[PDB]
Design a protein around this ligand. Structure first.
Ligand SMILES: O=C(O)C1=C[C@@H](OP(=O)(O)O)[C@@H](O)[C@H](O)C1
Ligand SMILES: O=C(O)C[NH2+]CP(=O)(O)O
Length: 427
């Protein structure tokens, strides 16, 4: 078991040029593959989740080239739905963005493809998306547990009236939205009840528009999509820096700055996680907004009690930043933390207690009361990049922290620790 030990960080200050957004990267790659023309993506993220999407596109016959640092990609669009037969197996690691998006997209036409991944992915739900795709005509078989990957896709999605449950993942709706335009018939997608992670739907619509397709959004309750459309290459497209990856560095300044500036995202970003900066401001930090940067400067840090359904990923960063805040912090309406890389409510509560906090693990919330002083712990990371990145913040105290399996950060941010070190100062 590999591990890394972080020594106490006296102060953080500096500038980080962010790695590309995983959310934007995977949507842009799939749309580029489906589109007509050559798309050149710049600032693309090089991480496991994007690599699995790239490998899937390669297996499906899509041609592309990558720059030396794998952040520039020139994709030759397929000019329509992707195809493969012979039950071609696509291994997608634990990349939900690739699993959910491809599960829908590959239902267009005829195909015979199997989507699978790492053991944890076979435990992450996909039944709501499968139910919706079937209502639209798709033939999908669960090869192991009902409602979970692996899936055998045999095509047939033609459109029509499709209901989709939006209470567990917004990715199911995203996948349907990206797929429906290329179906032969028009599709009316109706959301059954609640919709979680709503801001990611805006990312999806933004990318679709970039690639030439718009739909009718009726207050996020129903979406009307015209079929028979085609995606078109936007030419050169700049992938925004990752706002979720930015959270650690902005939080580090809120705790131990100094001023930390992240570049690649700014006030105009489409990512909902830029709203993480607003939470730091509510806790007492100072935030500055630019066209291509967001910066945070240390002020004070007070506990907050907030519904975090709009920023589920970056919200994990508040759970460890809470160790440094005055008072008890409560993060609410985050049930789906339980169905992601690991059950994050169980994992976060378990590891936070190890450094001294008193924690109430609610069914869909977490309440954190910090200790007077943190203690050393060897942190388990549950094959979850964010557990490693969130707990790295423990080193902004007087105690070192040991992080198990630090390479798990590669799911979205291979160079995380070197970037944290870049802004770590001894004086
Ligand atoms: O659509 C996307 O790019 C994502 C949506 C979110 O998932 P849920 O909608 O399941 O919360 C988020 O947690 C994931 O990292 C990326
Ligand atoms: O990035 C995260 O914090 C959670 N990602 C879930 P996925 O992208 O695998 O569906």
């Amino acid at each position: 078991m590999e591990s890394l030990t972080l020594q106490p960080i006296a102060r953080v200050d500096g500038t980080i040029n962010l790695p590309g957004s995983k959310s934007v990267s995977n949507r842009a790659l799939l749309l580029a593959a489906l589109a007509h023309g050559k798309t050149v993506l710049t600032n693309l993220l090089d991480s496991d989740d994007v690599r699995h999407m790239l490998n899937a596109l390669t297996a499906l016959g899509v041609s592309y080239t990558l720059s030396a640092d794998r952040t520039r990609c020139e994709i030759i669009g397929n000019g329509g739905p992707l195809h493969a037969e012979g039950a071609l197996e696509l291994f997608l690691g634990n990349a939900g963005t690739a699993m959910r998006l491809l599960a829908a997209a590959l239902c267009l036409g005829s195909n015979d493809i199997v989507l699978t991944g790492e053991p944890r992915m076979k435990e992450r739900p996909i039944g709501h998306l499968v139910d919706a795709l079937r209502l639209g005509g798709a033939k999908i078989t669960y090869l192991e547990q009902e409602n979970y990957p692996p899936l055998r896709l045999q095509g047939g999605f033609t459109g029509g009236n499709v209901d989709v449950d939006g209470s567990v993942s917004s990715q199911f709706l995203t996948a349907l939205l990206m797929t429906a335009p290329l179906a032969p018939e028009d599709t009316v997608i109706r959301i059954k009840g609640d919709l979680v992670s709503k801001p990611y739907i805006d990312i999806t619509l933004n990318l679709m528009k970039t690639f030439g397709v718009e739909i009718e959004n009726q207050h996020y309750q129903q979406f009307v999509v015209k079929g028979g459309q085609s995606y078109q290459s936007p030419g050169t497209y700049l992938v925004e820096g990752d706002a979720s990856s930015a959270s650690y560095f902005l939080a580090a300044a809120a705790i131990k700055g100094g001023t930390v500036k992240v570049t690649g995202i700014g006030r105009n970003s489409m990512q909902g996680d830029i709203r993480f900066a607003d939470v730091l401001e509510k806790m007492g930090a100072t935030i500055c907004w630019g066209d291509d940067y967001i910066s945070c400067t240390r002020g004070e840090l007070n506990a907050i009690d907030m519904d975090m359904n709009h920023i589920p990923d970056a919200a994990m960063t508040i759970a460890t930043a809470a160790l440094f805040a005055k008072g008890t912090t409560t993060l609410r309406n985050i049930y789906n933390w339980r169905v992601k890389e690991t059950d994050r409510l169980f994992a976060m509560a378990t590891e936070l207690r190890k450094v001294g906090a008193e924690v109430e693990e609610g069914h869909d919330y977490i309440r954190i009361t910090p200790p007077e002083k943190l203690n050393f712990a060897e942190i388990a990371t549950y094959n979850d990049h964010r557990m490693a990145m969130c707990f790295s913040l423990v080193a902004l105290s007087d105690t070192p922290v040991t992080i198990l399996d630090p390479k798990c950060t590669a799911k979205t941010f291979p160079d995380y620790f070197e970037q944290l070190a870049r802004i770590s100062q001894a004086a």
